Structures are given as structure tokens and as C-alpha cells.
Design a protein around this ligand. Structure first.
Ligand SMILES: [Ca+2]
Ligand SMILES: [Cs+]
Ligand code: NA
Ligand code: NA
Lengths: 91, 91, 91, 91
């Protein structure tokens, strides 16, 4: 579950990294950063896609990627950080 | 369910597209982009409504549209991407 | 329930409106707009508090106000828009 | 529960405050502010990490910290503000 959500999140972020570095001309790390803050809804206060292709892609990317990213965050905390903390609350 | 949430999400986005292109003078694609990142809470780091009508509309648009948009995202992932992935996890 | 969440959301937004217009010097509508996009997590890409008092207040405002605002959105959609749409799905 | 989530949220914010003030050169209050709006997904419309170390750290910080911060907000409202309001609804 967590492994598949992890793999799935990685693939979605790789696609965004390739898209923004190619179409929007961002350095790969900046494309990855933009993909991450976009799908987590944090957003970036400096950059917004400048091309129409970039705007359309971003719209579709958000709708398809938000659910998955939050599912991963949802499990990464409930099935990986909770116990590591819950079990660690046992005297 | 997914079909109605899909239709309902589309109508909400069409209203925002018409509103921002008319009152805030945005090109339609930019108005659609702003509507999408606003209702998904991603936000835009470059544009904020410049008119008071735009600010009031945005406030009301957020309260009314956020629930619907996330319900759609909630189903688009649970009832359309999960199985397509879950059923695909079957050896 | 919806009435109390509505009243409670209004009071929280009035406090933010008074705070930002006084301490950060924003016009009331801009202070209300900032309060709304902050508590809904949309954010504003143009304005961030400029004073240390404003930054501290914003931090506390977010932690205390986010839960309430989303509870209101949660009910405004589940107990006020769903049926109005659900009951309207009945042939 | 609320006490542990409170302590855990504080430690996560202290780490971000130390990181951004050191690597990104922000004044401590600005580093704390950035950490808070980032983990709550509000975002900041003015500042984005300028260094690659800062961008990578922010990506990891978001994935690890978002779940915890929202769990805290989730309990701070359900187990600390609801009753204080619910019990106060009793004539
Ligand atoms: Ca900006
Ligand atoms: Cs945001
Ligand atoms: Na958000
Ligand atoms: Na934002």
C-alpha cells in the first residue's frame, strides 16, 4: 500500500519534472519543486506557468495528482509515522 | 455520482472563467487557470483580483466551490483511479 | 449546526479584518480578502504581513481558524448543497 | 494526544525555523512564518527557497510535516474547540 503509493507519487512527480523543465524551461530541481508545491496545494509565490500548454497541463495535473499525493501523505503519517510514535509512547 | 460531480465542477469553473475574464480582464485561459488554482487552494503567486467586485466574488466563490471541487477530486481518485490501480495490482 | 458554524466563521473573519486593516494598514475589503484566502489555504500571491506582530498573529490565526473554516465548508456542502442537488436528482 | 501532537508540531516548526534562518538567511520570525504557511499549505506569495538545498529540504519537509500539522489542527478543533463551543451551546 505505502510502497505502491510511494511509487505512484514518484512517477507523477517525474512527469511534472519532465514537463516543466521542457515546456516551461525550468531547471529540473525547480520543475520538481514546482510539481511538489502544486500537488500539495502549497503553491509557489514566484512562478506560474507562462505558456498556455503549461497552464492547461497544470490544470489537468492538479485534478489528477492531488488525490494521489494526499493519499500518500495520508498513509505516510497513519501507517509509518503514527506507530513509530505511538509504539514509542509505550513506557 | 462521478458524472454529476464532473458536470457540477465544470459549471463552477465556467462561471469563474466568465467572471474573471469579464470583470478582471483576464484572457479566458488565464481566468480558467485562476479559477482552478483558487478552488483547489493551490493559489496563484502572480495574480490576485484587482477590483473590489473581484475580491468579493472570489471570497464567495471559494466558500461555495471548494467543497464541490474536493468532492470531485475525492471521487475521481477513490472511484476512478483506485480500482484502475487496485484491480491492476491483481497478479 | 450550520447556523453556529456560519456565525463562528463570521466572527473569525471579522477579527482578521479588524486586525489586518489596523496593524497591516490594509483597506477593510483587502483585510477580509486576506483573512479568507489565508484560512482556506488558498493564500495570496501578492501580500504577506510586513510587521512582526502581523506574522505572529497570522501564525496563530491559521492554527485556530483553519479547522473551523473547513468544518463550515464541510457542512455547507454536505448539509446545504448536497441535498439541494441530491433531492434535485430525483426524477 | 493533543499534548503529544502539540509537542510534535513544535519540534517540526523549530527544525524549519533553524533550517531557513541558516541556509536561506531568513530572520528567525520569517523562517518560522515560512515554515508555518508551508506546512499548512497556505504558502507565501513573496518568498520561495533560493538555494537548491532549500528546495530539496522544503520538498521533504512538506511530505513529512503536512500530515502531522493537520492532525494537530484536526484535534485542536475536534478535542479542544468543539466542546468548548459544544458544551457552551447547552442552555
Ligand atoms: Ca508573488
Ligand atoms: Cs496555497
Ligand atoms: Na491547501
Ligand atoms: Na498559495
Amino acid at each position: 500500500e505505502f510502497q505502491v503509493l510511494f511509487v505512484l507519487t514518484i512517477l507523477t512527480l517525474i512527469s511534472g519534472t519532465i514537463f516543466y523543465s521542457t515546456v516551461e524551461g525550468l531547471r529540473p530541481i525547480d520543475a520538481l519543486y514546482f510539481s511538489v508545491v502544486t500537488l500539495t496545494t502549497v503553491g509557489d509565490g514566484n512562478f506560474s506557468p507562462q505558456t498556455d500548454f503549461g497552464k492547461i497541463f497544470t490544470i489537468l495535473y492538479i485534478f489528477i495528482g492531488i488525490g494521489l499525493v494526499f493519499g500518500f501523505i495520508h498513509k505516510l503519517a497513519v501507517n509509518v509515522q503514527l506507530p513509530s510514535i505511538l509504539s514509542n509512547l509505550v513506557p
